[PDB]
Amino acid sequence: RKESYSIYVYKVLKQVHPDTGISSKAMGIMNSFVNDIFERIAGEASRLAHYNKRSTITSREIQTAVRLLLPGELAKHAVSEGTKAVTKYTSA
Amino acid sequence: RKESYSIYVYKVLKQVHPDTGISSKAMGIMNSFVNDIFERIAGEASRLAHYNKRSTITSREIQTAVRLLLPGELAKHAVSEGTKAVTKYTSA
Amino acid sequence: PHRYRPGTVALREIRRYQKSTELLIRKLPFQRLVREIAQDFKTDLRFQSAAIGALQEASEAYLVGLFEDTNLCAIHAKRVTIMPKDIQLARRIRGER
Amino acid sequence: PHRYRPGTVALREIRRYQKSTELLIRKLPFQRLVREIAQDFKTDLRFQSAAIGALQEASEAYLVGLFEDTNLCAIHAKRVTIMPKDIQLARRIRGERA
Amino acid sequence: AVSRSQRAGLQFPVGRIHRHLKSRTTSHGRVGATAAVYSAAILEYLTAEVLELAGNASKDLKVKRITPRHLQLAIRGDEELDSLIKATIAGGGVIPHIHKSLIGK
Amino acid sequence: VSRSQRAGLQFPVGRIHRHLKSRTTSHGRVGATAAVYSAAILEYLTAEVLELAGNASKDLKVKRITPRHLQLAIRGDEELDSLIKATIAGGGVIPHIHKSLIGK
Amino acid sequence: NIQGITKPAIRRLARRGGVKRISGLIYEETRGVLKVFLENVIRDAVTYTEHAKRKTVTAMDVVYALKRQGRTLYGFGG
Amino acid sequence: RKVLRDNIQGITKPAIRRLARRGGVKRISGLIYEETRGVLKVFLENVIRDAVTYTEHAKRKTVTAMDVVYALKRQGRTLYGFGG
DNA sequence: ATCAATATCCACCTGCAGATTCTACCAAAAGTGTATTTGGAAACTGCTCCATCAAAAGGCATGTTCAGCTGAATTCAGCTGAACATGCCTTTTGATGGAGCAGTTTCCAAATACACTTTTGGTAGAATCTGCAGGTGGATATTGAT
DNA sequence: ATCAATATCCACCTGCAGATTCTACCAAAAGTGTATTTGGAAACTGCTCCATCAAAAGGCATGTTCAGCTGAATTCAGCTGAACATGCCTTTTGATGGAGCAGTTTCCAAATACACTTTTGGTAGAATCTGCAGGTGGATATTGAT
Fold this sequence. Notes:
The complex is a heterooctamer, with two copies of chain A (92 residues), two copies of chain C, two copies of chain E and two copies of chain G.
Chain C: H1 8-17, H2 27-39, E1 46-47, H3 49-76, E2 81-82, H4 84-94
Helix pairs in contact in C: 3-4
Chain E: H1 4-8, H2 14-24, E1 30-31, H3 33-59, E2 65-66, H4 68-77, H5 79-84, E3 88-89
Helix pairs in contact in E: 2-3, 3-4
Chain G: H1 7-16, E1 21-22, H2 26-51, E2 56-57, H3 59-68, E3 73-74
Chain D binds a DNA duplex (146 and 146 nucleotides) through α1, α2 and β1.
């Protein structure tokens, strides 16, 4: 009944570190973490669209929101991944 | 075209200080103050609604938001004024 | 007979406690305190153990971080001993005032 | 010939400036500083005059507020002269970076 | 024909504030009839509190018109407004203060 | 045929869209790719934290990442540290002792 | 009750904080501060509790309260 | 145009002394003036970078006072008196 | 830096149990396919307001000199806070069983959203009042030499 | 103590810049209808809390001793504040052209909105296993003392 990002955090753990496990208290941290960045990114994106008298939060809002929220370098790569995932997904 | 809170700030001014004017820069400040506090209330109130899986923002949300944002004495008095106006309004 | 010099054990405890991560306030006295404070706001309250545990975590994280900034103010004054004026200055520059 | 003792004019100036509200940095050089920094981010930018007005008010608000904290750190060290290490202690505790 | 502001005994505009609540939240978001009223009420009360103290300040300086300096004096001088309003008032200056150590022995 | 798999992501694009839709606004709408983009950067960031956190645990020859390892990873990295000024429950602090406090 | 936050405990907290030597007056100072801390957080937590018409302060009510004082905590539901 | 450089030195020693005076500072060490310039520059970079990010997003070439007011709110240095 | 004798700390290896991970089914999303809406990018365009330029003039920045007094260095001794091994009161913990009461769920009255067609309040410039910004000139400190 | 030298008031004064009023369309607030939910409102679970008891086991409180640190007092090199002369560069007044906001319009590519089909992720019990926390004993760090 109560959803979580546990499943997906563990999946990501197994790519960068197939060897490694994660304790449940640590998994709690990653959860709080993913919820927090999600809510920051989401908040800034809504704000952006409102400042510009728009209504649809597009990936353009998200991207700018990332430039505003993430320290450069974390932001560079985060812009890559998103641009990647998006082009690859619009290829049918 | 561009709305403002000026004629209302001015009305309230005449009530407390019938003799006193307000330079336009001071009114600019007052406008920023009203829009600010409005955003904090509305923000806190929408978040309150979210934490309780409710989709409507009622006077009951606003009242909690005010208890959370306003310190001590300002809160007691703002709650009385809000309660008073609501029960006056709900008298058809 | 054996004694360590003033400061030697102190530095040992710094090293030990900066190494560990357990709560350093005792659970029960802390629970007593949280409940007493809460009673002044709403009566016959009940607390999730998770909520008491969050409060303690936040509290100790807060105090430990405040002791870091207090030490900096003490060192600023060519001391080695923190004093309440060190806590006062830190809280002032922090805006907790 | 008449000389005020070291520090007397200084207290006059605190009283003067704490009483006034005008900007204390000259406008033109500050406008220049803003356009220099802005340009090292994106070429061919313009500025509404109120945008530079906003930056200057915030900038002086920030600096005045930081000298208050800086001053508390100097006094805490039982000094009367603010120094770079005071500004550094202020900013460390403020959570600002460095 | 009467306005909702009037119906609540308020100067602040209830309709407009009801219309900004709809505008900003949530998605599937609903705003009650009395959420707007309650909001106009506390916006108006706070405006009154600030203008009450600001006005006193400018009477203490024998001038008729409130300026940002007066707003700043009022807010910094009131323990609770000072805590509520951690914003920068353009044009405001600061509250005159000189630490004792600095005053010439 | 799911949108996460289409975008080449581990993170749940569908769910992220349903959450975004619930953020803004009455009026509000949410682009197709916005959900994808968001999910993309949430995944990247947790990979970055788990990467470093993994190293911290290997450098202690343990298999399971704990909150200590997340704390050491995050505080020991300039940018993650800037980004995350949250409190990591049970992570403790980075060992550090001021020069002036060491014995002579 | 505040006195139940004992001196060796305050000692331990300071040690984690890098403190070598502690003035004898720090202990009463530290409790006053910890007390202002908990009062500010709990008041907000209880306000979230009452809003939800509950008699039980949940961990989420504290996590939300901490987020409002700008003391975000990871590990307890957000 | 003309090349812009060394404009931080346009924040003169007397301007910094005046700002310190409003901040209640009585005596100033000679090394304060270059510290202050350094700190002002980091302040302005951060605010202008964010402001310009708002400009670029909205596809404008002109930084508005709204861009600056939003940038400051992000940095937790909320400003009143320009906001419309 | 060696002599000694503490104690501390640091590997290496060890054994269970508290947590983790792997296994097996049921609903609420997540994905499809259709049918509308619609918001926001076009493509013109009216028209602020932003970048320049010019030009005159005094409000200030710059640079130097001179020495007052502040910060930094040094010495000292009173006494505050660290270390210690003692003695006991409080926290820890771990089931038990009762129970308060979060969290469901099922049900409809009130409260909300729409929606076409009213009426009015407030914004944008014109039109008039008028505070107050500093200009000036002497009475009241305030400061610093003697 | 007194002057002497400046700085600071504090009140009075007059048209200018900026404020308070005055006047017209447009968006928006209002009163009608009808159609849809929302989230109390009751009534009953099961969690999961509080309140027990009851050891043994810590971890705290207590008092003594003195190392060593903080604060006070003293000295002095020289950094920094005050004042002055000089003149540049900011300010201010006012134009010019036009770049580029921002106000209208059309109108597809992109969304919401169903209604069904099909999948996955959450829960609750199985099935190992990481590593806590315990042992040893080797080397280290600390402190007294030819």
